[PDB]
Amino acid sequence: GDLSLLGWNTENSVSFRTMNEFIKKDNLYPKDFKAVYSYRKMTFTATGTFDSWEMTTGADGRNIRFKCPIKYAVYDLDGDVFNSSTENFLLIQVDLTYFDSKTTINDPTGENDGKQFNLKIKTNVLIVTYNLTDTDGSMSSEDKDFLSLAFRNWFNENIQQFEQIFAYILLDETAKIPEYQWLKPTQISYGSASVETANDEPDLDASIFSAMSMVENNTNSTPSHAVDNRMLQLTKTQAAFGISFPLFIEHFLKQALLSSQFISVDDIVADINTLTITNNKQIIFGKVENSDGKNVDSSLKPGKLKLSLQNNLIVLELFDLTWEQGRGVTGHFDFRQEYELALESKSGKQIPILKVHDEPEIEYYVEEAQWKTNEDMIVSAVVGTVFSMILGASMKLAGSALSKAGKLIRSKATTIKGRKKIYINRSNVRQLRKDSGATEIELERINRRNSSIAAEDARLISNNGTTSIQTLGDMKKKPMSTGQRIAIGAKKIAGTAVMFGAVGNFGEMLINYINAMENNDYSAIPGINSFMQQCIGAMQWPDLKVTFGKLQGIYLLGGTL
Amino acid sequence: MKINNNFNIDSLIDNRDVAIVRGRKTDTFFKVFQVAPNIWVAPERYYGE
Numbered sequence: 145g146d147l148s149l150l151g152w153n154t155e156n157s158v159s160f161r162t163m164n165e166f167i168k169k170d171n172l173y174p175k176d177f178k179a180v181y182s183y184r185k186m187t188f189t190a191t192g193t194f195d196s197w198e199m200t201t202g203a204d205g206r207n208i209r210f211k212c213p214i215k216y217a218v219y220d221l222d223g224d225v226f227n228s229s230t231e232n233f234l235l236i237q238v239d240l241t242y243f244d245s246k247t248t249i250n251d252p253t254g255e256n257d258g259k260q261f262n263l264k265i266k267t268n269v270l271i272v273t274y275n276l277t278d279t280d281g282s283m284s285s286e287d288k289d290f291l292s293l294a295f296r297n298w299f300n301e302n303i304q305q306f307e308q309i310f311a312y313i314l315l316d317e318t319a320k321i322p323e324y325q326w327l328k329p330t331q332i333s334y335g336s337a338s339v340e341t342a343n344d345e346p347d348l349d350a351s352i353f354s355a356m357s358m359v360e361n362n363t364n365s366t367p368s369h370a371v372d373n374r375m376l377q378l379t380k381t382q383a384a385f386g387i388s389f390p391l392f393i394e395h396f397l398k399q400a401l402l403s404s405q406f407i408s409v410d411d412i413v414a415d416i417n418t419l420t421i422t423n424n425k426q427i428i429f430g431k432v433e434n435s436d437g438k439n440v441d442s443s444l445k446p447g448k449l450k451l452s453l454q455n456n457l458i459v460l461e462l463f464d465l466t467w468e469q470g471r472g473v474t475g476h477f478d479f480r481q482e483y484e485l486a487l488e489s490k491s492g493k494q495i496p497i498l499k500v501h502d503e504p505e506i507e508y509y510v511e512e513a514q515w516k517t518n519e520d521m522i523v524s525a526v527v528g529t530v531f532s533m534i535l536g537a538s539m540k541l542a543g544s545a546l547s548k549a550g551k552l553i554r555s556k557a558t559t560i561k562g563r564k565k566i567y568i569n570r571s572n573v574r575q576l577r578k579d580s581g582a583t584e585i586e587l588e589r590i591n592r593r594n595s596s597i598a599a600e601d602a603r604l605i606s607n608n609g610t611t612s613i614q615t616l617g618d619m620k621k622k623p624m625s626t627g628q629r630i631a632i633g634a635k636k637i638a639g640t641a642v643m644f645g646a647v648g649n650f651g652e653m654l655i656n657y658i659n660a661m662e663n664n665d666y667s668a669i670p671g672i673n674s675f676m677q678q679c680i681g682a683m684q685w686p687d688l689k690v691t692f693g694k695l696q697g698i699y700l701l702g703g704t705l
Numbered sequence: 706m707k708i709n710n711n712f713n714i715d716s717l718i719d720n721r722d723v724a725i726v727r728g729r730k731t732d733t734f735f736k737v738f739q740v741a742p743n744i745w746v747a748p749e750r751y752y753g754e
Contacts (some may be wrong), residue, residue: 284730 147372147699151364152356153331155386156683157375161348162705164198164384166686167308173197174305179298181290188294192217201346202340205369208238208336221287221335226278234274236299240310240334249312253681254328258317263310263334269299305406311355312684321648325677326395329357331364335371352376355683359391379692381702385679389453390416392699396644397421397451400637402609405601406449409610414590422451429465430629431620433538436529440467442626456695457501473514473522478507487693493671494690496645498638506568532627535582536590545579590631595662598635602651647674676703712738714748728752
C-alpha cells in the first residue's frame with residue numbers, strides 16, 4: 145500500500161537515465177567485440193564495434209538488464225558474410241555485487257576509516273532478447289539464434305572488459321560527527337525495479353534502481369533486493385534518499401520524549417511494533433497552578449504520553465492526566481496533536497521545518513455526580529487549569545468570553561457508560577484560538593521565552609539526553625503554569641528534530657539551532673546539504689540539489705543532479 | 706518393423722523419440738513423435754501455410 149523496505153533501513157535510489165548518463169561519462173564499457181562460436185564443424189563470427197550501452201526497462205530485483213546497440217558488425221556464418229543494420233542491438237542480463245576494492249573515494253563528512261566497496265558484475269551473463277538484421281533482410285531466424293549464441297559466448301568470455309564501477313560505498317566507517325552514525329551503512333545491498341510506459345517503451349526516468357543498506361549494526365537475516373516502484377514516480381526526482389520509520393522512532397522520538405523532562409533514562413521503553421514511544425511507569429508532567437492556588441503534581445499514567453506517526457504526521461498524545469482538583473472531584477483530559485515535517489524555500493535554500501498540521505483533538509471525562517452536584521463551582525478551577533493548555537500560560541480572562549465558550553462546552557456534553565464525556569474536534573480548537581484574544585505576537589513572545597528556557601534545560605540535559613533527578617527537581621520546583629510546561633516540552637521536542645534537520649556537548653549545537661530558529665541565523669548552518677552530504681558521503685555516485693522531501697511510509701527526500 | 710503407439714500429445718520430451726523442433730528456418734516450432742526409425746508425426750497443422 146505504501147513504500148516498504150522489507151527489513152532495510154536506508155535507501156538511495158536513482159533513475160535509469162541517470163545511471164545511463166553515469167555510464168556514458170565514465171566510458172568504462174567495451175567498444176570492440178569479436179564473438180566466435182565453433183560447433184558441429186560450423187564456425188560463426190560476429191566482429192564489430194558496440195555503441196554506448198543503455199540500462200533500460202526489464203530489470204527487476206537481482207536482475208539487471210542492459211541494452212547494447214551495435215554500431216557496425218560483420219557476420220561470418222561459415223563463409224556467409226553479412227553486414228548488420230544500424231538498428232541492431234542486444235539485451236544482456238547481468239547481476240551486481242559490492243566487490244571489495246582498494247579505497248579511492250573520500251568522505252569529508254566521515255573519518256574514512258571504513259572499507260571501500262564498489263558495485264561490479266559478478267563472475268554468467270545471459271542475453272534475453274536481441275535484434276540482428278542485415279541491410280537487405282536476408283537473415284534467417286536460425287542464423288540470428290546462432291549469432292545470439294556467439295554473443296552469449298562473447299559476453300561470458302569478455303565480461304572482464306566491462307570495468308565499469310556502478311557505485312561506491314564506505315562500510316563500517318565511523319562518521320566524522322559521532323551522533324549521526326545512523327547515516328553510515330554497515331550491511332549494504334542493491335535492488336532494481338523497471339516500469340514500462342503506456343506506449344510499451346523503456347522508461348529511463350520512472351524506472352528505479354535502488355541501493356538498500358542497514359545502519360547502526362542492524363542485523364538483517366533476509367537480504368532481499370525487491371524495490372517499490374512508486375518510490376521515485378511520486379518524487380519525480382533523479383535521486384532520492386529514504387530513512388526507515390523505525391530508525392526515525394527508536395533514535396529520534398526517544399531523544400525528543402526523554403529531553404522533555406517528563407520521563408527519565410530508566411523510565412523509557414522503546415516499542416517498534418506500535419511505532420510509539422511512551423513511559424513504562426507513572427510519570428510527572430509538570431506543576432499545576434489551579435484556581436485554588438495550590439501546586440498540584442501532574443501525573444501521567446503509564447502508556448499515555450504517546451509519541452508516534454499517524455496519517456503521515458508526528459502525533460503527540462496525552463491521556464489519563466488525573467489529580468485531585470478540589471472538594472473530592474476528579475476529571476480526566478485527553479489531548480492529541482498533529483505536526484508535519486515540511487520543506488520551506490527560504491533565502492534560496494531548502495530548510496526542513498516542523499509546522500503544525502490541522503487542529504488538535506481534545507476529550508474530557510467526568511463523573512455524573514460531580515456534574516449533578518457541583519457543576520458551577522468546580523468549573524472555575526477547571527477553566528483555570530484548561531486555559532493554560534490553550535494560551536500557554538495561566539492568566540485570567542473576562543467572563544463574557546467565558547460564557548460564550550461555556551454555552552458550547554455544555555452543548556457538547558454526552559452520557560456514555562454512566563460518565564459525562566465531552567469531545568473537542570478540529571473546528572472547536574481553531575474557534576478557541578480565534579476567540580482567545582491572544583495575538584500571534586504574544587504567542588511568539590511565549591515561544592521565545594520557551595526557547596530560551598529550553599536552551600537552559602538542554603544545558604541541564606546530559607550527553608545521553610536525560611537529566612539527573614536532582615537537577616530535574618531543581619528545574620521543576622519553580623512554580624510555572626502547566627500550559628507553559630506544554631510549550632517548553634514542545635520546544636524541546638522540536639529542538640531535538642535538529643538531527644533530522646542539521647547534521648552536527650550536543651547542548652551547544654542545539655543552542656546554535658535555537659539561535660537559528662529564533663533569530664533566523666543560518667550563517668554557519670549549511671541547511672539540508674549536510675544531511676544530504678551524509679547521504680552522499682558514504683553513497684558516492686560517479687559524478688546535486690535536493691528539492692523534494694516527504695514521508696510515505698518512509699522519511700523520503702528527492703533531489704535533482 | 707514396430708510402430709510406436711505408446712505416445713500421447715502430453716508425453717514428456719525424451720530428446721530422442723518425442724521432441725519439439727523448428728520447421729524450415731522460420732521461428733515456428735512444433736512437437737513431433739518418432740513412430741519408426743527416421744519417420745516422425747507432427748500432430749499439428751502445417752506451419753508453412
